[PDB]
């Protein structure tokens, strides 16, 4: 839907980029996310990313792809990426890809910010 089928929300808290997702995260949609995020990383010195999946309706391997791509971006700058408000459906995919061994998970945004020494 031109972001309907998804809805991306971004906010920088000092050196941290928060990405809040609402909708389905698939090939079509994960490409748009990638475009907006990589765009913010070029324009600002972002060290950490927090990904709020609380309102996420769906996710496929296209969702894992864009997440790892973002982690490698964050990895080089010596940062951390934290996902929060993850539903079981989505948590499951993190278990197969073994994405967890590289991405910290938290209950909500506040605990993700605490994990990044911001709060």
């Amino acid at each position: 839907g031109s972001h309907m089928s998804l809805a991306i929300d971004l906010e920088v808290k000092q050196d941290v980029l928060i990405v809040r997702l609402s909708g389905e995260l698939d090939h079509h949609t994960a490409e748009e996310l990638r475009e907006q995020v990589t765009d913010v990383l070029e324009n600002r010195a972002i060290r950490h990313i927090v990904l709020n999946l609380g309102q996420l309706t769906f996710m496929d391997a296209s969702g894992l792809g864009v997440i790892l791509g973002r982690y490698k971006q964050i990895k080089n700058v010596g940062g951390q990426m934290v996902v929060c408000a993850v539903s079981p459906a989505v948590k499951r995919l993190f278990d197969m890809s073994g994405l967890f061994k590289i991405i910290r998970v938290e209950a909500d945004e506040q605990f993700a910010l605490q994990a990044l020494g911001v709060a």
């Binding site: 698939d26 769906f58 496929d60 391997a61 790892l68 197969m96």
Partner: protein, 136 residues
């Protein structure tokens, strides 16, 4: 008894959501659970995306064909591909393997299909096409 649906559509990423939702709709007749449905939609999306990114390289003139033959409570799903194919299918069957890293693909596609379905048969001949059969 049986009921069957077939869906074809241009290989564009804006149709993907549409396709898996359509399949999930038809399957809904077997009163599945939200998890059962989620796995199928995930699976459809996984296979359909394979056809679109690895058969037709994002090119839309291609056609993806999904077949859903339901019978005696079983869902027999299939996907097609008159585009480029898999030269070493068995090697593709290897966890994490991908042709597209510039496109950030992680090689999960099949691993996901195998874990969500009771069966996964991938047939293919190069330059001819690719056909993934899933059962649940």
């Amino acid at each position: 008894m049986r009921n069957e649906m077939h869906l074809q559509f241009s290989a564009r990423s804006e149709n993907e959501s549409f396709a898996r939702v359509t399949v999930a709709a038809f399957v809904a007749q077997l009163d599945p659970t939200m998890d059962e449905l989620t796995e199928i939609k995930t699976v459809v999306s996984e296979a359909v995306t394979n056809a679109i990114i690895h058969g037709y390289n994002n090119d839309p003139n291609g056609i993806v064909s999904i077949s859903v033959i339901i019978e005696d409570g079983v869902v027999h799903l299939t996907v097609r591909d008159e585009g480029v194919g898999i030269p070493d299918i068995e090697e593709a069957r290897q966890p994490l393997f991908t042709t597209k890293p510039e496109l950030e693909r992680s090689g999960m596609g099949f691993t996901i299909m195998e874990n969500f379905m009771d069966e996964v048969i991938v047939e293919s001949e190069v330059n001819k096409g690719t056909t993934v059969y899933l059962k649940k």
